[PDB]
A paper describes a structure:
However, much remains unknown in plants about the unique organization, regulation, and localization of the enzymes required for de novo biosynthesis of pyrimidines, which are potential targets for crop improvement and weed control. This metabolic pathway starts in the chloroplast, where aspartate transcarbamoylase (ATC) catalyzes the condensation of carbamoyl aspartate from aspartate (Asp) and carbamoyl phosphate (CP)1,3. Each subunit folds into two subdomains of similar size: an N-domain (aa 82–221 and 374–390) occupying the center of the trimer and holding the binding site for CP, and a C-domain (aa 222–373) bearing the Asp binding site.
To gain further insight into the reaction mechanism, we determined the structure of atATC in complex with the transition-state analog at 1.6 Å resolution. Surprisingly, the structure showed the atATC trimer with [name] bound to only one of the subunits. In contrast, the other two subunits exhibit an open conformation, similar to the apo or UMP-bound states, and have the active sites empty or with two sulfate ions and one glycerol molecule from the crystallization solution. Only the CP-loop interacting with [name] is well-defined in the electron density map, whereas the other CP-loops are flexibly disordered. The phosphonate group of [name] binds to the N-end of helix H2 (N-domain) and the O atom of the carbamate moiety interacts with T137, R187, and H215 (N-domain), whereas the N atom binds to L350 (C-domain). Also, the α-carboxylate group binds to R248 (C-domain) and the β-carboxylate binds to R310 and Q312 (Asp-loop). In addition, the CP-loop from the adjacent subunit binds through S163 to the phosphonate moiety, and places K166 at interacting distance of the phosphonate and the α- and β-carboxylates. In turn, upon [name] binding, the CP-loop rearranges into two short and nearly perpendicular 310 α-helices, placing S163 and K166 to interact with the transition-state analog and moving A164, A165, and S162 outwards the active site.
Author numbering:
A (entry chain A): 71 to 77, 80 to 160, 166 to 390
B (entry chain C): 80 to 160, 167 to 390
C (entry chain B): 79 to 390
The structure:
Amino acid sequence: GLEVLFQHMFELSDVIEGKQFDREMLSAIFDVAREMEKIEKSSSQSEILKGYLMATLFYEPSTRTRLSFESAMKRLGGEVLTTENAREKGETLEDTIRTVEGYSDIIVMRHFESGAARKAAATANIPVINAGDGPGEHPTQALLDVYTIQSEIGKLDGISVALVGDLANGRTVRSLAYLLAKFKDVKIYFVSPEIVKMKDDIKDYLTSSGVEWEESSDLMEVASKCDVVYQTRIQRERFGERLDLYEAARGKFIVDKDLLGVMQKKAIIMHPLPRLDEITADVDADPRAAYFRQAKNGLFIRMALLKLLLVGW
Amino acid sequence: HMFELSDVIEGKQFDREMLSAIFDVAREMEKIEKSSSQSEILKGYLMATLFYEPSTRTRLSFESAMKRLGGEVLTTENAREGETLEDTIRTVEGYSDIIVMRHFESGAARKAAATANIPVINAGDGPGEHPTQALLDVYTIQSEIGKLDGISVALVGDLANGRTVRSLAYLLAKFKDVKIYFVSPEIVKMKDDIKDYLTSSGVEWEESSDLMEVASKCDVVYQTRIQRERFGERLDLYEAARGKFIVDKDLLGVMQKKAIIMHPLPRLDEITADVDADPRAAYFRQAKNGLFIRMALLKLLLVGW
Amino acid sequence: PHMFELSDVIEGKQFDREMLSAIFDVAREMEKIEKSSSQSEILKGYLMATLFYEPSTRTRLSFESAMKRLGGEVLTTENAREFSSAAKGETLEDTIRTVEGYSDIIVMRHFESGAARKAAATANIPVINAGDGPGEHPTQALLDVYTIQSEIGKLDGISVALVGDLANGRTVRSLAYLLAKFKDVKIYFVSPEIVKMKDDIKDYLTSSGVEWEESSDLMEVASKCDVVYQTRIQRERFGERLDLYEAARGKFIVDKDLLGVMQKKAIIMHPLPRLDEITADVDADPRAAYFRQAKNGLFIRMALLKLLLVGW
Ligand SMILES: O=C(O)C[C@H](NC(=O)CP(=O)(O)O)C(=O)O
């Protein structure tokens, strides 16, 4: 047990939550994801994960998320046991995990209830990847978001990112803010109506981490100063019975051609998806519309994590 | 050289010479499928199946075809699970090399092809078209009757909503001296867009309500299911359209010895079970042929001629 | 090398003692394959179609994993009732006849008993019954017997308690049926009175050389058995009498106190899923064998796929 360094397993046994990652780990995972890009663009079929089986358990169905993981597995030469609709007499999640783990080498689970992923990881003796834990953690979304910024902008230190939309309740913007705080000289703009502003826990965490942040309800002003505009929807229900606030916000938190008109030439638009009319279809025609390149980057990040969890470094 | 089509969406995309060449490739794919050795033609390629409506033959034949050629498959049997179709397609194309989609809306497959930079195959777009059914149907006719020029074909059943017979009519129009009979309840007669296309193409067609007479004169009797899911809330019209045109032993008794019965499947009551024993009952051979035709299309779209 | 004597795996009565023992030996070979670092290619080139008219993630994945661990491939239908063309009204026979055009073996779980026999008669390729509504589930019975052999070390001379709804339980009836092919077996029947084991099984056991005993005292029985085989009380079997379901439900529980009276090397089995009839505490005991049991289903199902497609 004395062998060290080159004389190796991934330090994570499961991928469950953002707080598992530090800056050095992110940088190394992103290095692996760049290698996975090279593999996926090659004409030659990879055999890195030949002989390994992934079981997907989508209790909350997600065609996009599931296919990204299943594609990642097959692009590496692994195979897949698919369950696109795992929601179905007496079965705890723990009993399903303890059965399915006998049939597979890795489990990818998306659930509709927060807390499921931690329970599955604690139960399983094979690696678990959380593919979305109800409205809670979605760690590979956060990883692919940061990777996309690094790819598109060329750096993570010193950038300005606008987080737009349902900041109070949105796991994607909260988790992205959490990981960005691991880099240096980051400035975050929180753009939203007051009723869905970012909660104090993330604000206090950013301040404690030395991250500059600013709240604004003026998307046109913020977007002109940012490298990244990261958009999410504010659903009508989040205004509750306050129709006056819904009407005051109408048309004010949309990414449209006019917004792109004030943005820098090398800035980007991101969106974790699914996207509705909070990004207009016209925006898609702009090279700065990065949300489908972002989704593609999920393939490379998920390839990297499957490789690391199954065969290590 | 590369395949002249970038997508397989509409029956009108195919010309006569292309059809004959595809049929040759299908016969080569039958040799692969019967062989003991595992093909690697499509090694490294991934197909995404996106099925928004139920399917047995179309989805499984495409998936089997891909695997028999050495490619692999990402399956979605329940894609209705919202975002636009264009968002779904631009996402899924990042994960795959070809998309096979059955959608519930007519026109969806052409929208998908216009958005995607990888080949799209229309596995059925609402009551619109079903081009690979039409391809395997014409391949089956050629295989069973030995000719396409000069044949007489009866299209029977729910023609209005039948994406199968709509695409098949487009392909039959590429051959010479074809006669098509339309036999249906009035409720579900063939739509005017198909009628107008055949008339403009110079294809002789005739509506009749006398299936015994029509069947006695045809090389092919192509029966269809009354398309319940397309009737919406008009379940009155659905039940009224059923039971009027049945392929049974008495109908086979007036048909020529060299004629065939086809059906894209599934059938409910409209072909009786005792027809299956007749050598002219071709609908299970027809379904098997879809494997070879879909192998041919995957090969052509991904690696060319 | 020779052909497997079965063309399909449909029902327990297809199996005799010699066949069971031979399949269990193959299953041990499959365990060695599954533990190996090398991908098997025994079933390279073969295709399985799964047709789960009654969705069952655990059962379906066990079969699909078995196929892929042997190097074969799979055409999946997770919910054939809703997403195959059965949803358009297609008969089972037409579905099976069609699907064999794309595949080499069909694994089907249906909601209606009699479906598996119909599929086998229609198909000219092997069919495996993965659960025939309330009827036969033959690979569950096979993996159950295999698990006993593996955990206890023998099948001759064992004592097994079958606990739960014995009257209608396909798993306990089918397990009793196969255990009777071995020698000097004793079976204890523990159940609420309303769902006692029916006379057809009792008479078969008596005439097959199996001693059996009814008891309502699980604590007494469990101290004398190699195997306590627990099942879930199912609401549907009580019709329009929820009150009778609730009365039956909590009467026979495998809990820490029951484990405390069991023998040192006895085991607890359960076909799954379970509700509360095995308490969570029990999972911590090495004698809790129901997850090893589920894993053994992989090896048994690998063995059957191999035998049906490439023989002995
Ligand atoms: O459904 C029909 O009746 C005809 C046609 N049938 C098929 O394509 C066969 P399947 O639905 O099994 O793929 C269709 O339009 O979907």
